Ligand binder design. Sequence first.
Ligand SMILES: [Ca+2]
Length: 110
Amino acid sequence: GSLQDNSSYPDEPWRITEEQREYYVNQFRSLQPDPSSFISGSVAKNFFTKSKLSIPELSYIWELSDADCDGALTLPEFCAAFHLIVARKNGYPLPEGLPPTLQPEFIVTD
Ligand SMILES: [Ca+2]
């Protein structure tokens, strides 16, 4: 009788309407003086550490953020970067992140 589920609202395309993009730019802006422009790579990876709680696990968070070894990410690029950081403080399981995806650490399945 407890734990119900009369609500339907999946998530993927990050669909929205100035409801999340506003808070997404207010952060990337705290460091980026320009309205949009692009933030550096070592600069964003410096504060990005604020969710995984201890254990520096930003190695996979950034590996997915950057996509051209440019060590930089325009504002549009940061829009997805933070989307991955919230997944930790949100409690969302890890769907993907690396090319592989089966048992790179559990060979013996028995
Ligand atoms: Ca990039």
